[model samples]
Target: VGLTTLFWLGAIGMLVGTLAFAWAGRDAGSGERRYYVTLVGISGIAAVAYVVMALGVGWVPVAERTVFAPRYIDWILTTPLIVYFLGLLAGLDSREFGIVITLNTVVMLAGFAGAMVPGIERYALFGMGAVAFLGLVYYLVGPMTESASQRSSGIKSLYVRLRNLTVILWAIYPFIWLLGPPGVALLTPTVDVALIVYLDLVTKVGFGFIALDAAATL
Candidate 1:
């Protein structure tokens, strides 16, 4: 009942996010428009994911828990793009870009693994995801920040703001998982889906608004 409604809302939110990014690119130069392209792709994939979830296609039983498999699948596909956008801002070389992107992928994969498993094994994989997340943080704050420091003042400032925003927002996901059906079972599955939809609206759409606006000036 409530689950389908929230999933549909999530889909609409992602569609709006994609449209906003595409519309923002209309007046932008090719180089500037590239940011919008990346942002659009992120939201576009999410739009599809939410629609699939709304259609009741991807939920699965795992470890006696009703796990939404599509959510992990969505993260696996989209999270790397998030890092790739940051890599562009950081002016990372191909190798450095690949490293950070790979780290983020590992984080998602670990989470997916944790979600699929049961018993203590689930917690152990969550620990692995946490370790990969720490690695992602190290690269971002260390080398990625250093690379951005070499850019123009505007680029540097925007990169820091966006990077910090990404980190802070992404950090919330695990806590939500811990409190939701997969962990302590504090939140019903419907509530978990609703909370995540709102978070996605903020993280992707809000992040694109800030990034695209800043890119226009650069």
Candidate 2:
């Protein structure tokens, strides 16, 4: 089960990285070119590491049970960030977006390392949680200060659309984490289902409203 999950994880990382690289490479501006390169490189290394870990290289003996489960759980938990960061970087590529992505990526990588590094999971979780909370603050408190008129013609509509959409999803992701598989173990089944259902409604329906509002105003 472990090996199977790890293989699929690596496959997903590679697939996402490859597709992102190809897409971003096509029309990326100077500022965005480096992000595309970084995304591909980071994802590639993660994929390779996943494969090596699956093969039992550098396997930490102490992580054989509880920590092992959480490590996989963390990968599953963090995959959305990886996938979204790639798409978000390719699509937005704004300075504000870049800051958010860079900080989030660092936290995620730290969390991944902490999970695998025997004695660091607790500290890693603290760092990850801090990053997540601060990211939430940045999303909610930061003004959509840039007007549509200020944006490039290519991304004007997209910026408004994605900003609102991303904010809504960002709001719901924590709740989803609290309710999904590994999260189900951490919370009561009833509470988990309720929270996930609420999150689904907020993300899906609420995000639609946000998109509609952005379009209407734009």
Candidate 3:
């Protein structure tokens, strides 16, 4: 599909994801409502980002690449929400919570930096992001997994699904970046846009559905 067409579809997906979360939480308990709120925020922000990208705005030329700044904007805002949503499930302490959020933020910034800079510097920044991503993942499968395992059966099940899905879905991003314009340019820009748009839908909307379905046990 065309770039604009893909982005427009992504916008629609995000909007639908937002409304789905709102509807799912209509009768949620006070505590459970936080999940819906965080999910809605993530999708709502992504919707705006996709809309801007679809409109042919927020494009910047850097390192000979047409980077979508709005996507980074979306990631900066939404990734923390994802971590926060997971943090809620993991019951992360303040220090570890801050560390994971900070690491993920660095991951986003480093990725953006790699896009912004040219030459070997780009790889350097990408390396930083890769390391930060490792830190983020380590915490997820290590401390967070351990913590969640100690929870009640229902919550434990929910955390396992969310955590595993998150790790799997999120890992695709770096590979896409490496093959797309910002990296080796193995994939055409149009193809990259299409892949990312679909990935966003699955990452956010699909994830929301899974979380809500699993939450029924809570």
Candidate 4:
């Protein structure tokens, strides 16, 4: 739990730091540069921490025998949130920020609550599904739509395309949870299932396009 807290703290710290840098340097048009730099640095630190944790150093002592515990796993699961939020903070607008943060905050809260309630924990899968869906919504309906036509010479068209696709794919997570196996047995098939499947497959293709675009951009 301590390690998990540290990871989130590091993530929030990086976000605050990056936001400060962007706000201060807005006029300089250096936001993108700073954004990428911050991401690389944060990712590097996370990688190092993961390595250390894996090798039985620092927080690993506390984490050693706790691996099978659900709460411990929950903490581990949140690492991606830290990473994703940093990326979103770097690239998204104020509205996008609010949307993503709110969704993530709710999910994390749910995860925490689920830790204490076995019945509630059964719905944890739904929480993950919600995360994917909300992430997709942010990409599809958020700043990306508004900024689509404004790409400068240095920006890759693929970035926009990939962002769109990734979110789309993410949206399917919830539907899969709702429809597949236990989810299907638990809930009746609703219109939402089809909607998510269609959106997921299409968006995944878009994700592929974005991947290609990224490669071409590089």
**Model 2, C-alpha of 206: deviation from truth (Å):** 21
Q: Higher-TM-score candidate among 1 and 4?
A: 1
Each candidate's lDDT (Cα)?
A: 0.86, 0.47, 0.90, 0.42
* Alpha-carbon runs more than 4 Å astray in model 4: 1-31, 56-92, 112-117, 120-125, 128-132, 135-143, 153-156, 168-218
At residue 28, candidate 1 shows an lDDT of: 68
Q: Write the per-residue lDDT of candidate 3 for residues 1-218, one digit (tens) a residue.
A: 68899899999999999999999989888778888999999999999999999999988987677999999989999999999988889888899799999999999999988987868669899989999999999999999989888788888888888888889889889999999999998999999989888888887888899998887755
Indicate which candidate wins on lDDT.
3
TM-score of each: 0.94, 0.46, 0.97, 0.43
Each candidate: RMSD = 1.5, 8.5, 1.1, 11.4
Best-performing candidate as measured by TM-score: 3
TM-score of 3: 0.97
Better of 1 and 2 by TM-score: 1
Q: Write the per-residue lDDT of candidate 2 for residues 1-218, one digit (tens) a residue.
A: 34445445554555555565546456656765554554454445545554555555544444332223333443443434443443452343466565655666654555445444545344546457556756644643353324333556644565545555555565555544434332334654334435533443333333334433543454
Model 4 vs. true fold: TM: 0.43
Model 4 poorest ten-residue lDDT run: 59-68
Show pairs that collide, candidate 3. Answer: none
TM-score preference between candidates 1 and 3, better one:
3
